[PDB]
Amino acid sequence: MKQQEVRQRAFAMPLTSPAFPPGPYRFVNREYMIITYRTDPAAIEAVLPEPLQMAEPVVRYEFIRMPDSTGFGDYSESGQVIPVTFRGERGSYTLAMFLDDQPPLAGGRELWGFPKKAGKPRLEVHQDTLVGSLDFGPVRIATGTMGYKYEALDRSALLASLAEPNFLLKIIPHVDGSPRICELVRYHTTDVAIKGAWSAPGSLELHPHALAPVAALPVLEVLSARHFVCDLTLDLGTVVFDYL
Amino acid sequence: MKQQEVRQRAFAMPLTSPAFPPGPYRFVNREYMIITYRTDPAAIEAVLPEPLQMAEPVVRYEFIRMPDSTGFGDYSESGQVIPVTFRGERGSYTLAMFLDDQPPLAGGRELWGFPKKAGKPRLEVHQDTLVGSLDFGPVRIATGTMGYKYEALDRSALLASLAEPNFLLKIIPHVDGSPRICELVRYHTTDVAIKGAWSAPGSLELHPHALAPVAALPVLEVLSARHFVCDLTLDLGTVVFDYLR
Amino acid sequence: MKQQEVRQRAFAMPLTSPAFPPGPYRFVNREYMIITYRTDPAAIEAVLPEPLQMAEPVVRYEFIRMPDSTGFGDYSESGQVIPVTFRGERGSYTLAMFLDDQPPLAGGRELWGFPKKAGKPRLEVHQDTLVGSLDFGPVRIATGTMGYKYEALDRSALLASLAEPNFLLKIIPHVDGSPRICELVRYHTTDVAIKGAWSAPGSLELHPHALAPVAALPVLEVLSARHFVCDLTLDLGTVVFDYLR
Amino acid sequence: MKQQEVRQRAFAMPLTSPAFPPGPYRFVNREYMIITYRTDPAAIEAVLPEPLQMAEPVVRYEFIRMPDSTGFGDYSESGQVIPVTFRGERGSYTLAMFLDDQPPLAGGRELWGFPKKAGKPRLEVHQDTLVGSLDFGPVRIATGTMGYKYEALDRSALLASLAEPNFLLKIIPHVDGSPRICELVRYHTTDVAIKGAWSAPGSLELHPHALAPVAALPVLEVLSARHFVCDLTLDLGTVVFDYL
Amino acid sequence: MKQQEVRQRAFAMPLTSPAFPPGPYRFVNREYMIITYRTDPAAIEAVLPEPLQMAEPVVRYEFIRMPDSTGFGDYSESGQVIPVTFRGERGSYTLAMFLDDQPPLAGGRELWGFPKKAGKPRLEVHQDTLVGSLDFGPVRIATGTMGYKYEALDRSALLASLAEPNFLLKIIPHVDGSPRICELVRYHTTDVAIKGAWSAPGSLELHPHALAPVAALPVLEVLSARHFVCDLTLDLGTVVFDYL
Amino acid sequence: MKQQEVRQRAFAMPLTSPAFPPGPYRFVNREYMIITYRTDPAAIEAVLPEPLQMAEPVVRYEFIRMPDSTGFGDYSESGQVIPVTFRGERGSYTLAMFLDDQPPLAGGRELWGFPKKAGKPRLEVHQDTLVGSLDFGPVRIATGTMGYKYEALDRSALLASLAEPNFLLKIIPHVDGSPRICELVRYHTTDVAIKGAWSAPGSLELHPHALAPVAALPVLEVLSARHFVCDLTLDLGTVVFDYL
């Protein structure tokens, strides 16, 4: 509690009982429903921050169950991710995520710079159908469906996809409201072990919301639906571009 | 979207739909129940970061209703504040807070460096008693009671505290886990219009929790209780010590 | 604790934690629905204690919301008031009241000698109708209705009644059952700020009950209905006749 | 309704339909759980009104079911009572009681001067355990437990205890707020018929409350627990000391 | 059925349909939350039977889920365990245990001498917190919490802890009420496989109860908390000291 | 807590807070519904342990409410009882019993050797019918019905069946699984006061269950139904035949 021990001990607020712990952040049996859809290219351009370059005019809309996550607990996630290139390198940009557990929400924002907001994601099998849903308070803003494990998915393509760089725009205001942090961050998921992976026919419907504008990239054509279960490690990011 | 527009628009993540808006953050009919209690001085020193210095060994345990908040909505808060001095100026230090609404939560942390976690605070009149509760998941970690408006409080004497400085240790990790922001912040509540203020007898019980350790400052005796309602602006804060200079 | 301190501290039981606190008893946004009805004059004389004298043969049946009361909390009341004169001064006599909160109940009785019993009064707007109800245990003993704010009322004319004296027969047994306190009390509501007042059509039905005999003054015809909201102080009362002099 | 008939008829408010009737107050099958505990002697001294003298630094914490009570009905009670002497005579002082029925609450206060407040007492057998509880609105302020009828209790000691004088500080304000009544009252329970009486291991926990400060005499050590069922008559009090 | 068949078939009551079966008792995915706290040494000395010897003034308070238990079914346990020495060997003494399933309750008492009573133990993750509770009828008697999986635990230390002897005082009355069995019993859990093991911050609160007096070992200071999942076999015990 | 205290204190586990107290075990307003049915004689001989001998081929199927039981609490029982001779003397053998309260279940098994298992017995009047039911988990295994108090029953004859010896086969395993106790126990209900006794038409239906096999003694023909209320003392039993 001397000034030097404060510098040394500081990690997250509150100092003496921080809102989230340090890693490694290990995920066991995270379960993904991802519905990939073609959207209006004009709508991607309108939200994409340079130096990031646009790729195919597609959105990957995700529902993730994370029943066993070190330091964070048991939670679910929904999100919009978009394919991009940075220095001609191919990866992903996360536009929006929604979580129902606070430690991964604060940790996500403050540490990597995931653009997390609060919401009620669910991902469940109802007899014959895998149903993904997202509510923001009392308003349903996303409903995804897939058939159940119709065909095995190619592990190669999947593992190569999970290996790609993931980019995020970390912004943190200074006490005065002006940006104190404002960088592009690259992170990876590593030690990936697939437990199973499948495709099936899929569907997505999005709904408008003032505070959760997923509907701003409209579902013109659903292209594919993938469902998979894996263990992985969410590695710390590194800054690849600093706006300041 | 060119990289100069990115730098202009940037306030909070996500860039194009921020988790919370800029102020001013106005508060109408903000309602307080504050229970002051004498605790173990050793427990206070364990948690107080220098150059902050300890005053009287008391905790002000608070429950707050905020039904009307610009940009944040309608929410409640409970938390633990202690009397402090910095450079021999008297003020408060916020040790822990707990809210049931996300924008004020992210906002609180990312902007001022309020030490916010999620919780279920309640403050409700039950016939003759004003009851403050805090639950953390299924566990009750704080229960406070007061009589209802027994004695009108010296209002002029109240604004005596509502004008003094509030200190916070703002900490934000860098991507690698080492601190990127680590500073003491001084903020003020300004524009304070008191609608009523009262004292009455009071009680408090706190329960242990691994992730909400309010009970760590133990309730040795209750000293006072106050209930008040007001309008108020939460002004943006200032750095008054930067640990990473 | 010496017997002089006992005599100084003594206000209400229990000595060290009284069932209700001293005033002033301030009331904010006190809301009234009052249904006035013509009853059998004989029924009024059966229950009116001399030297009180009967005026017009009417009952003002009231339902009152008191969401903000110093020392008492948040409660409701329903009861039966009659026009009276004492020494040719016009005022009211309270025949029966019913409350859902204990401190105002003990307070009411022990201090002023309000004739309070326990009950479940409600006063709520249901779309187009203002509905007053009183239940005594599982039994509905009073239902009142009004239209909603049809005609604004002459406010100056209203304070005409809110300034006149209210009489109560205060009775407290001695330990042996014979009366130790038995007096007529005059109290006033002062500091009265009316926020709104209205009239509309009205109805009333009352049902028998062995222990809540409101129906004993039967509803022969409804004469008027009024609805109003106000701030108000219930001043401490005065003895104006002592039956045990 | 002439002034003379008012004097004659007056008993309790309201005059013509009084809030509680006159006696005799007869109790059939009242059922007691009493947990006796040692407390801080300093805490008794702080609430004890002289001429009353302190005795052993113990509190008897009671839960009473009264299913059949003349003039009052069917109700439950919880309370703190403390052993005292008055003129070297041994008996009891009632610090706090809580009831869930209005006639015995008004009657109790106005007639004997029991220090009654409102609350939700319960006393119930749950399989193997006698559970006493007290709530004050939404806050539990007392929880007592006992085993079920482990051993028969000595009737002698019990009957001698129920025969002891019971003292109360009756206070009633005058219309102006200053004491109009302020006396020590002595009353007895008579025509006592025990139907059964037992002991077992017992427990008590108290919780703080601004308006119901039972916790102000802390449970240092539980000394005993007694459970008993009896008929009795609650006799009128007599004033043994008048402060005015 | 002849007298000889009776002895040959006799295992547990009822003879022809025993309340629990013979082993081996195998456990799959046993999940533990153990909070270790410092207590009053005099409070342990009050309850530890010689020839057992006290070690540290420490209590290991446990919440255990047993979803898959051969012979017994699917149940939960909460218990209070004291480090002891006996004949130069470090071990544990089981003071109290509470279970929500009858065959392992009768089985544990009558076979090993586990000190078991009935209760409602729970152990569940609520978002970011692991929460352990025990109710005895309507009364909460224990609440424990841990962070979720903050850091990995030394698996070698854990296995050595699961290898130490576990001592129980088995008592069974004769028909006349005098002891027919009164003996110290030693048992082990063997064939142990750790599926995972973590530490994190922890808390415990205990409440008094007349029939489940876990609160008689007060929580002066919480020392550690551990959370693990394992398979094991509860082996039959052996007598190590016969009091008769 | 010394060695020689251990064998003086020791009655039931846990040593310091036993699962059930010593007696006398006193029952007030024990209410019985007994349906007597003729069964397959071969089914009785299959379960009857020599030196016990079969009498009439009947079963007495019981539903018992025990609202007031010293040391045990308030609970219900259902069970199967057969007439028997031992050494030419007429008594009963208890085949099977089910209780909803732990202290009397442990106490019954460990002390007398009643063949007690957990279940949910109920006995209640529904308008015109006395209905006894027994559930074992989600499964109904016994439903009995009687008319309500059709004719007063000869008490002097009743009181006699209540003086007959009751025999039990007490079995307790040793820590190694071999029988440590295996004996016929004789016990009596004494100090009996019949408060009323009645007969009426009756019915009984039984359903199979793997772990509660009452249906193994099939209901061939219902012979009689009896309903009665009483106070009694369950005396400690005596060993009348030790298999070991």
From Swiss-Prot, chains A, D, E, F:
Principal EC category: lyase
EC number of the protein: 4.1.1.4
Transmembrane segments: none
Keywords, comma-separated and alphabetical: Decarboxylase, Lyase, Schiff base
Residues the record marks as site: Important for activity: K117
Molecular function per GO: acetoacetate decarboxylase activity
Lyase listed as a keyword: yes
Pfam families per the UniProt record, alphabetical: ADC
Cell membrane listed as a keyword: no
Catalytic activity as recorded in UniProt: acetoacetate + H(+) = acetone + CO2
Active site: K116
InterPro entries assigned to the protein according to its UniProt record, in alphabetical order: Acetoacetate_decarboxylase, Acetoacetate_decarboxylase_bac, ADC_dom_sf
Top-rank taxon, per record: Bacteria
Biological function: Catalyzes the conversion of acetoacetate to acetone and carbon dioxide.
Family: Belongs to the ADC family.
Subunit structure: Homododecamer.
Designated name of the protein: Acetoacetate decarboxylase
Source organism of the structure: Chromobacterium violaceum (strain ATCC 12472 / DSM 30191 / JCM 1249 / CCUG 213 / NBRC 12614 / NCIMB 9131 / NCTC 9757 / MK)
From Swiss-Prot, chains B, C:
Active site location: K116 (schiff-base intermediate with acetoacetate)
NCBIfam families named in the record: PRK02265.1
Pfam families (UniProt xref): ADC
InterPro entries for this protein: Acetoacetate_decarboxylase, Acetoacetate_decarboxylase_bac, ADC_dom_sf
Family: Belongs to the ADC family.
Keywords: Decarboxylase, Lyase, Schiff base
Residues annotated as signal peptide: none
Superkingdom in the source lineage: Bacteria
Keyword presence, Lyase: yes
Keyword Lyase carried by entry: yes
Reactions catalysed: acetoacetate + H(+) = acetone + CO2
UniProt-listed Enzyme Commission number(s): 4.1.1.4
Site positions for Important for activity: K117
Lineage per the UniProt record: Bacteria, Pseudomonadati, Pseudomonadota, Betaproteobacteria, Neisseriales
Protein name: Acetoacetate decarboxylase
Entry function: Catalyzes the conversion of acetoacetate to acetone and carbon dioxide.
GO molecular function: acetoacetate decarboxylase activity
Organism: Chromobacterium violaceum (strain ATCC 12472 / DSM 30191 / JCM 1249 / CCUG 213 / NBRC 12614 / NCIMB 9131 / NCTC 9757 / MK)
Subunit structure: Homododecamer.
Stated consequence of mutating E62Q: 20-fold decrease in kcat
